[PDB]
Short mmCIF file of C-alpha atoms and ligand atoms in Angstrom, two decimals:
data_model
loop_
_atom_site.label_atom_id
_atom_site.label_comp_id
_atom_site.label_asym_id
_atom_site.label_seq_id
_atom_site.Cartn_x
_atom_site.Cartn_y
_atom_site.Cartn_z
CA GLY A 16 7.16 -14.39 -0.50
CA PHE A 17 3.98 -12.99 1.46
CA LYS A 18 1.43 -14.22 -1.04
CA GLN A 19 2.44 -17.86 -0.75
CA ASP A 20 2.99 -17.39 3.14
CA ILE A 21 -0.56 -16.63 3.41
CA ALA A 22 -1.46 -20.09 1.62
CA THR A 23 1.22 -21.86 3.95
CA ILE A 24 -0.50 -20.72 6.91
CA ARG A 25 -3.95 -21.54 5.61
CA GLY A 26 -2.80 -25.11 4.80
CA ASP A 27 -2.07 -25.72 8.49
CA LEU A 28 -3.87 -22.76 10.39
CA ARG A 29 -4.97 -24.11 13.79
CA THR A 30 -1.16 -25.15 14.36
CA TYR A 31 0.31 -21.72 13.16
CA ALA A 32 -2.27 -19.74 15.05
CA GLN A 33 -1.84 -21.42 18.43
CA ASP A 34 1.90 -21.53 17.94
CA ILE A 35 2.20 -17.79 16.92
CA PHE A 36 -0.29 -16.85 19.89
CA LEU A 37 1.34 -18.76 22.39
CA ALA A 38 4.70 -17.08 21.24
CA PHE A 39 3.05 -13.66 21.86
CA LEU A 40 1.46 -14.57 25.21
CA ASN A 41 4.86 -16.13 26.26
CA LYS A 42 6.95 -13.15 25.05
CA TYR A 43 4.26 -10.70 26.51
CA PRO A 44 2.80 -12.44 29.43
CA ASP A 45 0.93 -9.40 30.53
CA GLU A 46 -0.93 -9.58 27.59
CA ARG A 47 -3.16 -12.35 29.15
CA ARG A 48 -4.94 -9.57 30.99
CA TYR A 49 -6.93 -8.73 27.76
CA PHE A 50 -8.44 -12.52 28.04
CA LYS A 51 -10.40 -14.58 30.34
CA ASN A 52 -8.77 -17.65 31.92
CA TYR A 53 -5.44 -17.90 30.22
CA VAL A 54 -3.30 -17.01 33.31
CA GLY A 55 -1.81 -19.78 35.36
CA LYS A 56 -1.51 -22.28 32.55
CA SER A 57 1.25 -23.84 30.53
CA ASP A 58 0.97 -24.01 26.87
CA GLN A 59 -0.40 -27.83 26.88
CA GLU A 60 -2.99 -26.53 29.12
CA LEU A 61 -3.98 -23.68 26.91
CA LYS A 62 -4.26 -25.94 23.90
CA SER A 63 -6.58 -28.22 25.77
CA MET A 64 -8.95 -25.44 26.70
CA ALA A 65 -12.36 -25.56 25.08
CA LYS A 66 -12.19 -22.39 23.31
CA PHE A 67 -8.28 -21.51 22.93
CA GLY A 68 -7.79 -23.09 19.61
CA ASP A 69 -11.15 -22.01 18.26
CA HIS A 70 -10.74 -18.42 19.10
CA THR A 71 -7.25 -18.25 18.01
CA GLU A 72 -8.24 -19.96 14.72
CA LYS A 73 -11.05 -17.26 14.22
CA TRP A 74 -8.19 -14.69 14.95
CA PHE A 75 -5.88 -16.00 12.37
CA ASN A 76 -8.75 -16.81 9.72
CA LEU A 77 -9.45 -13.18 9.63
CA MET A 78 -5.64 -12.06 9.87
CA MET A 79 -4.92 -14.05 6.86
CA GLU A 80 -7.82 -12.58 4.92
CA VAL A 81 -6.55 -9.06 5.82
CA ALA A 82 -3.33 -10.03 4.45
CA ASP A 83 -4.70 -11.62 1.22
CA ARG A 84 -6.75 -8.55 0.61
CA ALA A 85 -3.80 -6.19 0.91
CA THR A 86 -1.96 -4.90 -1.86
CA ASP A 87 1.98 -5.09 -1.29
CA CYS A 88 1.46 -5.68 2.25
CA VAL A 89 -0.86 -2.55 2.63
CA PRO A 90 -4.15 -3.58 4.11
CA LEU A 91 -7.53 -2.10 2.99
CA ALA A 92 -8.83 0.80 5.29
CA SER A 93 -12.10 -1.27 5.58
CA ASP A 94 -10.37 -4.02 7.14
CA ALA A 95 -8.43 -1.73 9.56
CA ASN A 96 -11.98 -0.14 10.67
CA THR A 97 -13.33 -3.49 11.49
CA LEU A 98 -10.54 -4.36 13.48
CA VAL A 99 -10.88 -0.95 15.34
CA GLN A 100 -14.50 -0.89 15.74
CA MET A 101 -14.57 -4.75 16.98
CA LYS A 102 -16.20 -4.85 20.41
CA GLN A 103 -13.91 -7.29 21.37
CA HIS A 104 -11.28 -4.87 20.87
CA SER A 105 -12.38 -2.06 22.68
CA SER A 106 -9.68 -2.32 25.20
CA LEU A 107 -6.82 -2.10 22.69
CA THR A 108 -4.27 0.39 21.40
CA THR A 109 -1.90 0.30 18.49
CA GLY A 110 0.65 -1.17 20.98
CA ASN A 111 -0.94 -4.81 21.41
CA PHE A 112 -0.69 -5.20 17.55
CA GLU A 113 2.66 -4.06 17.71
CA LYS A 114 3.76 -6.65 20.39
CA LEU A 115 1.63 -9.13 18.52
CA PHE A 116 4.10 -8.50 15.29
CA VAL A 117 7.05 -8.61 17.04
CA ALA A 118 6.34 -12.05 18.32
CA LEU A 119 4.89 -13.29 14.69
CA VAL A 120 8.34 -11.84 13.00
CA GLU A 121 10.32 -13.66 15.67
CA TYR A 122 8.47 -16.75 15.22
CA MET A 123 8.75 -16.81 11.49
CA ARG A 124 12.55 -16.06 11.60
CA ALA A 125 13.10 -19.21 14.05
CA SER A 126 11.02 -21.52 12.11
CA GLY A 127 12.33 -24.15 9.99
CA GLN A 128 9.24 -23.04 7.45
CA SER A 129 11.20 -19.80 4.37
CA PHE A 130 8.54 -17.24 5.65
CA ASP A 131 9.35 -14.05 4.23
CA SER A 132 9.60 -12.33 7.85
CA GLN A 133 10.44 -9.00 6.41
CA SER A 134 7.36 -8.70 4.46
CA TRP A 135 5.47 -9.79 7.72
CA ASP A 136 7.38 -6.95 9.56
CA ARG A 137 6.02 -4.54 6.99
CA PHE A 138 2.68 -5.65 6.73
CA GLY A 139 2.41 -5.17 10.54
CA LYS A 140 3.69 -1.79 10.26
CA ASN A 141 1.15 -0.79 7.56
CA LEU A 142 -1.68 -2.58 9.62
CA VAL A 143 -0.77 -0.48 12.79
CA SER A 144 -0.22 2.65 10.54
CA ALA A 145 -3.88 1.98 9.12
CA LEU A 146 -5.13 1.38 12.65
CA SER A 147 -4.15 4.65 13.76
CA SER A 148 -5.70 6.35 10.56
CA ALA A 149 -8.91 4.48 11.66
CA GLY A 150 -8.68 5.99 14.95
CA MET A 151 -7.37 3.49 17.30
CA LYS A 152 -5.37 5.04 19.98
CA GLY B 11 14.12 5.79 -2.45
CA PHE B 12 10.56 6.64 -3.52
CA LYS B 13 10.15 9.49 -0.84
CA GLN B 14 13.44 10.92 -1.73
CA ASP B 15 12.31 10.94 -5.68
CA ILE B 16 9.44 12.69 -4.52
CA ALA B 17 11.70 15.55 -2.91
CA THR B 18 14.06 15.39 -6.09
CA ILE B 19 11.07 16.04 -8.43
CA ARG B 20 9.39 18.72 -6.17
CA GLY B 21 12.47 20.50 -6.11
CA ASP B 22 12.65 21.47 -9.64
CA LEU B 23 8.84 20.50 -10.35
CA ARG B 24 8.27 22.58 -13.53
CA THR B 25 11.73 21.15 -15.37
CA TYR B 26 11.05 17.78 -14.09
CA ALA B 27 7.12 18.01 -15.39
CA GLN B 28 7.93 19.10 -18.77
CA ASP B 29 10.84 16.79 -19.45
CA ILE B 30 8.88 13.78 -18.34
CA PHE B 31 5.80 14.86 -20.40
CA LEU B 32 7.95 15.56 -23.53
CA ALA B 33 9.46 12.05 -22.80
CA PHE B 34 5.99 10.55 -22.69
CA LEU B 35 4.91 12.29 -26.08
CA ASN B 36 8.19 11.41 -27.69
CA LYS B 37 7.75 7.62 -26.85
CA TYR B 38 3.89 7.74 -27.48
CA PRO B 39 3.60 10.56 -30.44
CA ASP B 40 -0.11 9.69 -30.85
CA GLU B 41 -0.93 10.91 -27.34
CA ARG B 42 -0.46 14.47 -28.45
CA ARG B 43 -3.90 14.18 -29.90
CA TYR B 44 -5.41 14.79 -26.67
CA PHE B 45 -3.45 18.23 -26.39
CA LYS B 46 -4.96 20.05 -29.46
CA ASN B 47 -3.08 23.39 -28.64
CA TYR B 48 0.46 21.50 -28.85
CA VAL B 49 0.06 20.02 -32.06
CA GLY B 50 2.63 21.06 -34.62
CA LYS B 51 4.83 23.06 -31.99
CA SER B 52 8.45 22.27 -31.38
CA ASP B 53 9.50 22.01 -27.67
CA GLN B 54 10.80 25.54 -27.31
CA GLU B 55 7.65 26.83 -28.90
CA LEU B 56 5.72 24.79 -26.13
CA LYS B 57 7.90 26.24 -23.65
CA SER B 58 7.10 29.64 -24.83
CA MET B 59 3.14 28.77 -24.04
CA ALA B 60 2.04 29.59 -20.71
CA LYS B 61 -0.42 26.78 -20.42
CA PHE B 62 2.13 24.50 -21.29
CA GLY B 63 4.20 24.93 -18.30
CA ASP B 64 1.37 25.59 -15.97
CA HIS B 65 -0.81 22.64 -17.12
CA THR B 66 2.02 20.40 -16.94
CA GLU B 67 3.46 21.54 -13.58
CA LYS B 68 0.01 21.15 -11.96
CA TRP B 69 -0.26 17.87 -13.47
CA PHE B 70 2.96 16.73 -11.51
CA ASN B 71 2.18 18.44 -8.61
CA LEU B 72 -0.92 16.36 -8.38
CA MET B 73 0.99 13.22 -9.22
CA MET B 74 3.36 14.05 -6.27
CA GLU B 75 0.40 14.53 -3.90
CA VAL B 76 -0.85 11.24 -4.86
CA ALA B 77 2.89 9.51 -4.57
CA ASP B 78 3.05 11.32 -0.95
CA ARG B 79 -0.11 9.96 0.12
CA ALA B 80 0.59 6.58 -0.97
CA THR B 81 1.65 3.68 1.34
CA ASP B 82 4.39 1.22 -0.12
CA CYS B 83 3.30 2.64 -3.37
CA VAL B 84 -0.08 1.95 -2.84
CA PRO B 85 -2.53 5.12 -3.86
CA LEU B 86 -5.47 6.01 -2.08
CA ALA B 87 -8.48 4.77 -3.67
CA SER B 88 -9.83 8.64 -3.16
CA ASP B 89 -6.90 9.97 -5.23
CA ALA B 90 -7.67 7.59 -8.04
CA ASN B 91 -11.41 8.51 -7.95
CA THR B 92 -10.25 12.13 -8.35
CA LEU B 93 -8.32 11.35 -11.60
CA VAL B 94 -11.07 9.36 -13.05
CA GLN B 95 -13.96 11.93 -12.42
CA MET B 96 -11.82 15.08 -13.77
CA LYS B 97 -13.64 16.30 -16.63
CA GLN B 98 -10.36 16.64 -18.51
CA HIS B 99 -9.75 13.02 -18.19
CA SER B 100 -13.28 11.86 -19.50
CA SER B 101 -11.96 10.54 -22.77
CA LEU B 102 -9.16 8.57 -21.27
CA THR B 103 -8.60 5.00 -20.45
CA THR B 104 -6.34 3.01 -18.12
CA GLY B 105 -3.84 2.53 -21.27
CA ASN B 106 -3.14 6.33 -21.39
CA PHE B 107 -2.02 6.07 -17.99
CA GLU B 108 0.17 2.87 -18.57
CA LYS B 109 2.04 4.66 -21.47
CA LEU B 110 2.59 7.55 -19.15
CA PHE B 111 4.05 5.50 -16.56
CA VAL B 112 6.10 3.45 -19.10
CA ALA B 113 7.69 6.60 -20.29
CA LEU B 114 8.27 7.98 -16.68
CA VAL B 115 10.11 5.07 -15.73
CA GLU B 116 12.06 4.83 -18.98
CA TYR B 117 13.01 8.34 -18.30
CA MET B 118 14.09 7.64 -14.74
CA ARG B 119 16.25 4.77 -15.52
CA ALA B 120 18.03 6.85 -18.68
CA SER B 121 18.70 9.97 -16.34
CA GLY B 122 22.10 10.50 -14.81
CA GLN B 123 19.75 11.59 -11.28
CA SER B 124 19.32 8.59 -8.83
CA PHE B 125 15.70 7.19 -9.04
CA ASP B 126 13.98 4.27 -7.50
CA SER B 127 12.54 3.36 -10.82
CA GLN B 128 11.27 -0.34 -9.69
CA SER B 129 9.23 1.75 -7.01
CA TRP B 130 7.65 4.31 -9.87
CA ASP B 131 6.74 1.27 -11.93
CA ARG B 132 4.91 -0.44 -8.95
CA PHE B 133 3.14 2.78 -8.16
CA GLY B 134 2.07 3.07 -11.91
CA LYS B 135 0.79 -0.52 -11.63
CA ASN B 136 -1.04 0.06 -8.47
CA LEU B 137 -2.53 3.42 -9.62
CA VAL B 138 -3.69 1.54 -12.92
CA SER B 139 -5.61 -1.12 -10.71
CA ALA B 140 -6.90 1.67 -8.69
CA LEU B 141 -8.20 3.80 -11.70
CA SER B 142 -9.77 0.67 -13.12
CA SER B 143 -11.58 -0.02 -9.92
CA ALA B 144 -12.96 3.61 -9.83
CA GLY B 145 -14.52 3.13 -13.18
CA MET B 146 -11.79 4.00 -15.76
CA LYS B 147 -12.30 1.85 -18.87
C1 HEM C 220 -4.65 -8.40 12.92
C2 HEM C 220 -4.60 -8.84 14.09
C3 HEM C 220 -5.90 -9.36 14.83
C4 HEM C 220 -6.94 -9.81 14.38
C5 HEM C 220 -7.01 -10.15 12.60
C6 HEM C 220 -8.07 -10.10 15.11
C7 HEM C 220 -9.28 -10.71 14.94
C8 HEM C 220 -9.94 -11.26 16.08
C9 HEM C 220 -11.24 -11.87 16.00
C10 HEM C 220 -11.88 -12.37 14.35
C11 HEM C 220 -11.99 -12.22 16.87
C12 HEM C 220 -13.21 -13.31 17.38
C13 HEM C 220 -12.74 -14.27 17.91
C14 HEM C 220 -13.89 -15.16 18.61
O1 HEM C 220 -14.71 -14.68 19.33
O2 HEM C 220 -14.18 -16.24 18.07
C15 HEM C 220 -10.98 -11.57 18.13
C16 HEM C 220 -11.25 -11.87 19.17
C17 HEM C 220 -10.60 -10.83 20.19
N1 HEM C 220 -9.50 -10.31 20.21
FE1 HEM C 220 -8.38 -9.96 18.22
N2 HEM C 220 -7.60 -9.78 16.43
C18 HEM C 220 -6.02 -8.97 16.27
C19 HEM C 220 -5.40 -8.81 17.05
C20 HEM C 220 -5.78 -8.67 18.60
C21 HEM C 220 -4.74 -8.26 19.52
C22 HEM C 220 -3.25 -7.82 19.40
C23 HEM C 220 -5.30 -8.45 20.82
C24 HEM C 220 -4.79 -8.09 22.29
C25 HEM C 220 -3.32 -8.06 22.27
C26 HEM C 220 -6.37 -9.02 20.43
C27 HEM C 220 -7.47 -9.10 21.44
C28 HEM C 220 -8.85 -9.84 21.26
C29 HEM C 220 -9.67 -10.37 22.32
C30 HEM C 220 -9.33 -10.07 23.89
C31 HEM C 220 -10.88 -11.02 21.79
C32 HEM C 220 -12.02 -11.61 22.39
C33 HEM C 220 -11.36 -12.50 23.50
C34 HEM C 220 -11.29 -13.82 23.03
O3 HEM C 220 -11.46 -14.15 21.67
O4 HEM C 220 -10.51 -14.58 23.64
N3 HEM C 220 -6.93 -8.99 19.15
N4 HEM C 220 -10.02 -10.96 17.45
C1 HEM C 221 -1.01 10.39 -12.78
C2 HEM C 221 -1.35 10.98 -13.71
C3 HEM C 221 -1.94 12.21 -14.09
C4 HEM C 221 -2.27 13.12 -13.27
C5 HEM C 221 -1.93 13.45 -11.75
C6 HEM C 221 -2.96 14.33 -13.80
C7 HEM C 221 -3.27 15.73 -13.49
C8 HEM C 221 -3.80 16.59 -14.27
C9 HEM C 221 -4.07 17.95 -13.53
C10 HEM C 221 -3.84 18.35 -12.22
C11 HEM C 221 -4.69 18.71 -14.54
C12 HEM C 221 -5.20 20.14 -14.73
C13 HEM C 221 -4.11 21.18 -15.25
C14 HEM C 221 -4.75 22.25 -15.24
O1 HEM C 221 -5.84 22.87 -15.83
O2 HEM C 221 -4.04 23.49 -14.55
C15 HEM C 221 -5.11 17.67 -15.77
C16 HEM C 221 -5.32 17.95 -16.97
C17 HEM C 221 -5.26 17.38 -17.96
N1 HEM C 221 -4.64 15.97 -18.39
FE1 HEM C 221 -4.07 14.70 -16.84
N2 HEM C 221 -3.08 14.00 -15.21
C18 HEM C 221 -2.65 12.71 -15.20
C19 HEM C 221 -2.63 11.77 -16.35
C20 HEM C 221 -2.97 12.18 -17.67
C21 HEM C 221 -2.81 11.30 -19.02
C22 HEM C 221 -2.13 10.02 -18.82
C23 HEM C 221 -3.34 12.07 -19.85
C24 HEM C 221 -3.44 11.67 -21.25
C25 HEM C 221 -2.49 11.02 -21.87
C26 HEM C 221 -3.74 13.42 -19.18
C27 HEM C 221 -4.30 14.22 -20.15
C28 HEM C 221 -4.87 15.42 -19.72
C29 HEM C 221 -5.38 16.50 -20.42
C30 HEM C 221 -5.95 16.49 -21.76
C31 HEM C 221 -5.90 17.78 -19.42
C32 HEM C 221 -6.39 19.29 -20.00
C33 HEM C 221 -5.49 19.56 -20.80
C34 HEM C 221 -4.23 20.18 -20.21
O3 HEM C 221 -4.17 20.31 -19.03
O4 HEM C 221 -3.14 20.34 -20.97
N3 HEM C 221 -3.55 13.37 -17.99
N4 HEM C 221 -4.29 16.69 -15.53
#
């Protein structure tokens, strides 16, 4: 289930984080505009950049904490507030998060690993609801 | 599901409130000691007492407000806090609430009406957790 999936991801985090983030950027290439120096590069070029794996791991480290602090796939309001108020997220709207979770769920469904993808879809829905409640446009 | 159950209950709030409250007292007769004016009175006698229908409906009204405000059966901490801080609840512990939810779920399962009983159980569990976090003993 969802709780065990958090442990699965955490056990191989850099690999999952990079592969899910790449699935996101490839499904939605114009999302690269929110980042520096990602356009014009293949997956392997991205993975060999100095900061790519590091920043995506820090991403997913926090995502897994948000998932872990949730009850029944409902994130804490304080975690949602942190995500809204982060300077690095000042250009974002809930649509960015929605697209990330569409890609995340798709990745999980296609994976060989028994992820509980329906729970991840619910968690994404609930996180987006929480971001809205916290004042993300 | 849970949302429909809120509508079902709200549709005939007085009747459901009284029925469930009596089911609670019948399963856990010692809980009547918290309601000193209900000691030694038949169900019909209780129904003749203005405050029995009034307070019981108002309790279940607040229960329905808390249920409706929940996300996936996870209640707001602010709602748990309201329940803990009520002067009328100053002598209670989380065990009293646990018993209420056991009886409510039992009532739902026994009823002809088609309730999402598993969800009310989970809501009860999540509310008890939240009561404890808000300082109920
Ligand atoms: C639950 C989902 C998300 C979490 C937990 C999260 C968390 C984080 C964290 C921890 C950082 C700091 C990384 C660092 O500087 O080392 C970060 C940076 C950043 N985030 Fe997010 N984020 C999420 C969703 C998103 C989405 C959906 C977007 C855009 C589509 C996004 C855009 C950015 C950008 C542009 C930065 C700074 C630039 C960069 O690190 O490359 N974030 N995020
Ligand atoms: C989620 C569950 C509960 C909710 C939403 C709730 C809500 C309320 C409300 C709104 C009142 C005010 C009634 C009024 O004065 O008009 C009340 C009173 C009261 N509650 Fe609760 N309550 C809950 C659980 C319990 C439990 C489990 C007990 C004890 C077993 C309890 C004992 C009392 C007592 C003794 C009063 C005052 C006397 C009375 O109104 O009959 N409550 N509650």
